[PDB]
């Protein structure tokens, strides 16, 4: 099975001749056995070059070549998919851009597969990437590294160290030189110390002058010091001991004072273990150097740092490198680590050499899986480009101060077999077009539709520190990419080029640190986009937001592609970008689309993660300018064009039915702008969680009529979070930090500190927000945070069909909805869209009114006297029927429309139009059905106007009164406007009447009344045909009315001086009010309690509530919540829950509560009463003195009998069994302070627990993997 175990292989050894060219032709079945340096290698005519492997994995081979050119049946094998390569091989691609000559199709520094070429590489199978099963605070410690040093801190400097957490509890300086009162506060300091607290001391300047014998006795007693009895003048001394630890828990030293020097330091150092197995050393010192008396401490991690992971990583080896991602807004918080030899590590742990500088989440935070991804980079098959210490030549050096010209791999069409697996690709790619670390160029169908038995696959590579892209797909369908890692590369990491690439499946792939590039406009950052005008027209200055700044980790230029189990852990702009090309571009720019892209239904999208990005997590909009730079459109070719309207239909056929695009199990957090932006017709986002984003989710469509007739936009079974317990880390270019909304803690923020954080944004529509839950949305005095809101600075449409249903709000959600105010982010808040903000509360889950509509407070076109003023939301709650009217005006530009309802004439609405850049500006206010309005202008009357009835049911109607000069003839026509072909069908004319009263009798007749006194052209707008679903227009078209005026009066057509109070009617109520219902519905919210990226493993949400003294007086109980079960208890004592770890849903086998009296009986029950393999949940309440259980916690998980002590409450989660999980934890506190509200997540049905495998765990992801294969 092995390719090197081929007997026909000759052993090869060419030498070190950088000018020796090599050609492997027919019969040349060579087996490389030693390091080599040749100019080139060309494998052709059936030649074979296999790397020689060993049964043990020791033969380190390093090839070095200007290039390798595989073609015409030639083969290059480094192991086989069945008999994999075991030693460490390396192919170094060298040669500068301007050194020697270059190839025609290829550049230099490459490995190039051609037609019929065989490139077969298969490295050592390792584990690609998993998640942190435990968090990792900076500097390796739970509460961080302490370093201190100061000159002339005279006296006895003291520090206390929590023996379980290595936290600095107290820091004090007792001037036992001058003041005898100080040697007295020092002795009383050591009397009230908890036993077992690590203590360190260091003489500052000169102690031993006012020091008392009662204190020197206390030091010898509490800490086991043998030398304190004889401290002297200007004598340095440092100690590190354990309170009540006897003499053997102590380590001390001393130095004399001679010739103004101590001849060296006086160091005291011991090692301890956190209760988490992490080792740390407490260090203290005091010395004299030529006169200075320094004194310092250092509490730091020692013997490497032990990391916790989700899955088994036994395949990782010392001397290999890994990477831990950012769990904060700045992607530059990802870090590199080198694996230490660890004999004491389990299957879910390794040891890293370095000290972490940042914070990396390893827990599920408030139901959102914020665990940091962790991936291995070192392989045994390496293909690397040779680079320089700094930039050179015209390799884009004004932007990069380093070499950006490495190697690249390139595979042409009609090849034989490409199968790359477990290969390391360092310093690959060039800043030249087509030169990418793995470049599949125009290969066509490469699966069962192209003729490949083994579909061409890329399995678990490692492409890091590359100079352009990571893997590029150039006009290739059906490719597979699996378990691959792309780190610190330029331009879009994973790249779908021309927008024709379909059937490609991306499974469980990871991408970090996607930095700006210089290739495409979309790849450039703000500085590069304003510089490279070499491809723009004339003196045009490119705009860096509308044409560039589109750096994405996953660039999907076509939707028919399957994205599963991936994770975009950081990017300069976006994490996953789905976009659409109007017609094929690039080198594929030519063949006609037989299925235009923005009509093709989305492939699979299931269980993805996106975080650490500045512009978006998942983005679905925009296109590429499919035209070169010209005089009518000077934008660069392939820049960003916001004129793409997704609208998926069957077979990409707009005459055929709609096909919804499913966004499933998206997890997205710590994004600076949007968590997800999705536009078009028929999109359903479900089972998704959004957290710590500036805006959680936004649904778009079009600004006038929807991009696809009948466009529903659903979000169901989702979860939103505002400011979770992921306080982030103020570092790694984290540009924003502020005050939390709830706890008012220092945390990192997405944008400026006054940005109103938002959960869901309403825009365009029609949008169905259902069965979703919002948590932790509190505003600060700076910003107006809210759960549900609207898009800022909106001027377009908003429909009253946007309904929010079955939504649940958390206890820390103070502002359910908000409509904006004049401020820094809303500006006027006075544009055409801001004024017409509205949604529909179907069931009464948002406002407490079954079937009620909500809009902005000062919008008087929707108000009847039964409404409820709401000032906090800046809104108003009412009920009725509502639609919209679109008013197009010609002949007059920059015109501002003023429309008023008769019933509230003192409250008109001045609109400013929609096309203040085009020639046909329309105005789109929202109205209440079966009412009368009037319209007036800030200028002369338009000679032609169209009235569209949008969202009208049959027989729904309003009366309208247009202001015209007293001197006008009219000609009014109705018709059905067919959206498809611009034709007007079934046209009817209007006939005048004598009075407003005669037209009222003829309400369903095509009649109009003109009041020459006021100038009002009255008529009735009534719909004849029916609607269907959510389409804005009727069955037989978009009903519209056309009014052709004939006048020469240039006067401001504003009749309100004359129209009222002549046509005033007393305000009435068509649809009356219900009553409130503060008390949530049964069913409100999302069914799922926790959203993880391993949906197959069931996670048990557990939540505690241990009040304090002011709350125990006020009566608040102590509660242990399990999946939503409040096991309440208020007696002073202990509540112990025994949960079966194999039951899903959980089966709690025993609940027990121990009073303060029978506290002594918990010793016994813990020793025996706990069934084997049983999850222990335990929380106390009140002053519990002497809990002789400090030692009884270790078999359940702990490392050493930690010290709760005193009378403080405690909370513990453990396991009675052989295994010792990573989630086991403990929370101690002083009495009366309590523990507040914490939240843990316990996985269930793990084979570590000792549970049987009832059935095979239904991995829904892998089912989508085998379905999309064939
Ligand atoms: C329908 O009725 C309106 C209203 O006319 C009313 O009744 C008469 C009796 C007068 O009292 C008016 O003041 C009332 O408002 C008519 O509008 C006015 O029409 C008259 C006659 O056409 C206009 O008087 C002229 O105005 C000229 C100014 O406009 C000219 O100059 C500009 C300058 O650029 C030029 O661009 C434009 O094309 C015009 O040619 C003025 O030069 C001239 O000497 C004469 O006085 C009066 O100005 C009109 N009002 C306004 C606001 O313009 C309508 O004309 C009438 N319909 C039709 C079809 O005629
Ligand atoms: C804007 O300018 C860019 C250049 O900066 C320009 O891109 C060029 O487009 C042409 C499109 O024809 C590309 O030419 C192709 O070259 C490949 C091989 O290199 C050929 O195989 C292609 O022909 C195939 O397609 C035909 C149609 O089916 C078949 O009949 C034929 O037999 C072949 O199968 C094609 O000739 C050219 O490579 C690019 N160049 C670059 C640098 O991208 C772009 O077209 C300009 N914009 C517009 C709108 O034209
Ligand atoms: C633009 O596209 C629109 C949508 O395709 C066109 O809309 C029109 O919509 C009406 C609906 O009110 C269609 O009415 C159809 O009526 C036929 C009945 O005719 C049948 O019988 C006669 C024999 O008497 C036969 O000659 C016909 O071919 C039919 O077989 C029904 O079968 C339909 O279900 C439907 O009710 C119109 O047909 C339809 N127009 C067309 C051209 O189909 C709009 O007309 C288009 N405008 C332009 C300018 O092309
Ligand atoms: C914690 O509490 C949660 C409360 O929501 C639990 O989550 C849900 O628990 C219910 C328990 O009834 C599960 O319902 C199961 O559904 C599966 C699958 O059938 C589904 O599909 C069919 C149609 O094919 C439909 O008719 C069913 O109603 C289901 O919707 C069945 O095999 C079971 O018999 C049972 O009906 C939910 O599926 C589950 N929600 C999920 C998994 O998202 C949770 O289990 C509790 N325990 C934990 C988290 O450990
Ligand atoms: C490790 O993670 C923890 C948890 O987020 C971080 O702990 C926080 O550290 C800050 C230090 O600036 C504490 O602020 C101060 O705490 C003292 C002691 O109670 C208090 O008297 C001050 O008023 C101030 O609040 C903060 O309390 C603490 N978190 C909590 C919940 O108390 C820590 O910063 C992370 N990193 C390291 C290196 O420890
Ligand atoms: C790749 O090679 C195949 C095989 O030669 C080409 O497929 C065609 O296969 C049919 C089978 O009946 C032959 O009759 C044709 O002569 C083959 N060639 C052509 C041009 O049709 C295929 O065209 C090749 N593709 C490329 C891009 O070279
Ligand atoms: C938003 O509300 C509209 C109107 O209330 C809903 O449209 C109704 O849908 C039902 C189907 O369940 C139809 O039977 C009714 O005829 C529709 N019109 C009504 C009640 O006036 C719509 O389903 C809601 N959701 C969306 C996304 O539009
Ligand atoms: C309700 O709010 C509007 C908005 O300004 C205000 O004009 C009106 O007086 C208020 N009425 C009541 C009864 O609060
Ligand atoms: C429990 O521990 C305390 C230590 O504070 C000790 O005094 C007491 O005697 C212990 N309990 C029993 C029953 O000995
Ligand atoms: Cl209970
Ligand atoms: Ni290519």
PDB file of N, CA and C in Angstrom, residues 848-873:
ATOM      1  N   UNK A 848     -47.629  43.869  25.725  1.00  0.00           N
ATOM      2  CA  UNK A 848     -48.749  43.552  26.586  1.00  0.00           C
ATOM      3  C   UNK A 848     -50.063  44.000  25.985  1.00  0.00           C
ATOM      4  N   UNK A 849     -50.251  43.708  24.699  1.00  0.00           N
ATOM      5  CA  UNK A 849     -51.486  44.058  24.006  1.00  0.00           C
ATOM      6  C   UNK A 849     -51.650  43.082  22.849  1.00  0.00           C
ATOM      7  N   UNK A 850     -52.625  42.180  22.952  1.00  0.00           N
ATOM      8  CA  UNK A 850     -52.836  41.194  21.900  1.00  0.00           C
ATOM      9  C   UNK A 850     -53.277  41.893  20.617  1.00  0.00           C
ATOM     10  N   UNK A 851     -52.502  41.704  19.545  1.00  0.00           N
ATOM     11  CA  UNK A 851     -52.762  42.296  18.229  1.00  0.00           C
ATOM     12  C   UNK A 851     -52.783  43.826  18.324  1.00  0.00           C
ATOM     13  N   UNK A 852     -51.584  44.376  18.489  1.00  0.00           N
ATOM     14  CA  UNK A 852     -51.405  45.815  18.598  1.00  0.00           C
ATOM     15  C   UNK A 852     -50.191  46.231  17.783  1.00  0.00           C
ATOM     16  N   UNK A 853     -50.252  47.445  17.247  1.00  0.00           N
ATOM     17  CA  UNK A 853     -49.184  48.012  16.440  1.00  0.00           C
ATOM     18  C   UNK A 853     -48.452  49.087  17.231  1.00  0.00           C
ATOM     19  N   UNK A 854     -47.157  49.236  16.954  1.00  0.00           N
ATOM     20  CA  UNK A 854     -46.296  50.156  17.688  1.00  0.00           C
ATOM     21  C   UNK A 854     -45.476  50.971  16.698  1.00  0.00           C
ATOM     22  N   UNK A 855     -45.352  52.271  16.959  1.00  0.00           N
ATOM     23  CA  UNK A 855     -44.592  53.157  16.098  1.00  0.00           C
ATOM     24  C   UNK A 855     -43.931  54.269  16.881  1.00  0.00           C
ATOM     25  N   UNK A 856     -43.341  55.251  16.202  1.00  0.00           N
ATOM     26  CA  UNK A 856     -42.689  56.346  16.909  1.00  0.00           C
ATOM     27  C   UNK A 856     -43.734  57.278  17.513  1.00  0.00           C
ATOM     28  N   UNK A 857     -43.356  57.930  18.616  1.00  0.00           N
ATOM     29  CA  UNK A 857     -44.343  58.613  19.447  1.00  0.00           C
ATOM     30  C   UNK A 857     -44.998  59.779  18.713  1.00  0.00           C
ATOM     31  N   UNK A 858     -44.208  60.601  18.030  1.00  0.00           N
ATOM     32  CA  UNK A 858     -44.739  61.799  17.392  1.00  0.00           C
ATOM     33  C   UNK A 858     -45.349  61.529  16.017  1.00  0.00           C
ATOM     34  N   UNK A 859     -45.470  60.269  15.612  1.00  0.00           N
ATOM     35  CA  UNK A 859     -46.118  59.924  14.350  1.00  0.00           C
ATOM     36  C   UNK A 859     -47.625  59.937  14.579  1.00  0.00           C
ATOM     37  N   UNK A 860     -48.280  61.025  14.179  1.00  0.00           N
ATOM     38  CA  UNK A 860     -49.702  61.210  14.436  1.00  0.00           C
ATOM     39  C   UNK A 860     -50.595  60.697  13.313  1.00  0.00           C
ATOM     40  N   UNK A 861     -50.024  60.088  12.277  1.00  0.00           N
ATOM     41  CA  UNK A 861     -50.811  59.504  11.196  1.00  0.00           C
ATOM     42  C   UNK A 861     -51.362  58.134  11.552  1.00  0.00           C
ATOM     43  N   UNK A 862     -51.091  57.647  12.759  1.00  0.00           N
ATOM     44  CA  UNK A 862     -51.445  56.289  13.148  1.00  0.00           C
ATOM     45  C   UNK A 862     -52.114  56.290  14.514  1.00  0.00           C
ATOM     46  N   UNK A 863     -52.402  57.476  15.041  1.00  0.00           N
ATOM     47  CA  UNK A 863     -52.871  57.632  16.410  1.00  0.00           C
ATOM     48  C   UNK A 863     -54.380  57.832  16.457  1.00  0.00           C
ATOM     49  N   UNK A 864     -55.053  57.022  17.268  1.00  0.00           N
ATOM     50  CA  UNK A 864     -56.421  57.280  17.683  1.00  0.00           C
ATOM     51  C   UNK A 864     -56.450  57.539  19.189  1.00  0.00           C
ATOM     52  N   UNK A 865     -57.445  58.279  19.696  1.00  0.00           N
ATOM     53  CA  UNK A 865     -57.363  58.773  21.082  1.00  0.00           C
ATOM     54  C   UNK A 865     -57.260  57.696  22.159  1.00  0.00           C
ATOM     55  N   UNK A 866     -57.252  56.420  21.778  1.00  0.00           N
ATOM     56  CA  UNK A 866     -57.131  55.326  22.731  1.00  0.00           C
ATOM     57  C   UNK A 866     -55.692  54.848  22.910  1.00  0.00           C
ATOM     58  N   UNK A 867     -54.726  55.520  22.290  1.00  0.00           N
ATOM     59  CA  UNK A 867     -53.345  55.068  22.306  1.00  0.00           C
ATOM     60  C   UNK A 867     -52.710  55.295  23.676  1.00  0.00           C
ATOM     61  N   UNK A 868     -51.559  54.656  23.871  1.00  0.00           N
ATOM     62  CA  UNK A 868     -50.819  54.683  25.125  1.00  0.00           C
ATOM     63  C   UNK A 868     -49.481  55.355  24.852  1.00  0.00           C
ATOM     64  N   UNK A 869     -49.300  56.564  25.380  1.00  0.00           N
ATOM     65  CA  UNK A 869     -48.002  57.224  25.312  1.00  0.00           C
ATOM     66  C   UNK A 869     -46.962  56.420  26.085  1.00  0.00           C
ATOM     67  N   UNK A 870     -45.839  56.128  25.433  1.00  0.00           N
ATOM     68  CA  UNK A 870     -44.700  55.479  26.070  1.00  0.00           C
ATOM     69  C   UNK A 870     -43.486  56.362  25.822  1.00  0.00           C
ATOM     70  N   UNK A 871     -42.932  56.920  26.897  1.00  0.00           N
ATOM     71  CA  UNK A 871     -41.819  57.858  26.788  1.00  0.00           C
ATOM     72  C   UNK A 871     -40.467  57.157  26.811  1.00  0.00           C
ATOM     73  N   UNK A 872     -40.347  56.074  27.586  1.00  0.00           N
ATOM     74  CA  UNK A 872     -39.066  55.383  27.707  1.00  0.00           C
ATOM     75  C   UNK A 872     -38.639  54.782  26.373  1.00  0.00           C
ATOM     76  N   UNK A 873     -39.569  54.136  25.670  1.00  0.00           N
ATOM     77  CA  UNK A 873     -39.294  53.629  24.332  1.00  0.00           C
ATOM     78  C   UNK A 873     -39.334  54.719  23.270  1.00  0.00           C
TER      79      UNK A 873
END
